Amino acid sequence: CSVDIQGNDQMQFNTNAITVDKSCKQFTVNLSHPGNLPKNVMGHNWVLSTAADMQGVVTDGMASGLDKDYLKPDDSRVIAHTKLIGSGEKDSVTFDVSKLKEGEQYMFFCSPHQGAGMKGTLTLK
Ligand SMILES: [Cu+2]
Numbered sequence: 001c002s003v004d005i006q007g008n009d010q011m012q013f014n015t016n017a018i019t020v021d022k023s024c025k026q027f028t029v030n031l032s033h034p035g036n037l038p039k040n041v042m043g044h045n046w047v048l049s050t051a052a053d054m055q056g057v058v059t060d061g062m063a064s065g066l067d068k069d070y071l072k073p074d075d076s077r078v079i080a081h082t083k084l085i086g087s088g089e090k091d092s093v094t095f096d097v098s099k100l101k102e103g104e105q106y107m108f109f110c111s112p113h114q115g116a117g118m119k120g121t122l123t124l125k
Pocket of ligand 1: 043
């Protein structure tokens with residue numbers, strides 16, 4: 001009921017496909033940042049939304065800027081998210097699996113780097 005995820009100095013997560021076991025009550029993502037670049041150069045977060053909401057979350061987050069960790073304040077579309085981290089930092093987020101529904105498609109992504117491909121799927125199993 002947990003996954004360790006890395007975002008590196010080249011806008012890449014170490015996985016592009018997460019599976020959440022339907023028997024989990026909560027799910028935890030442990031985000032870390034191998035490499036050497038700080039968060040005001042190559043910072044990463046881990047953000048979860050439906051596939052349909054991803055674009056809006058990204059656009060509005062980029063617009064909100066570094067001072068808001070690249071997320072729109074109180075964004076109702078964001079199911080769960082970590083803070084923005086630089087190399088050597090770490091952050092975890094836990095959310096209730098009840099927030100995910102059968103038949104929906106979910107995406108995870110780093111909001112400042114989603115346009116550069118830093119995204120992947122999240123699926124119940
Ligand atoms: Cu990033």
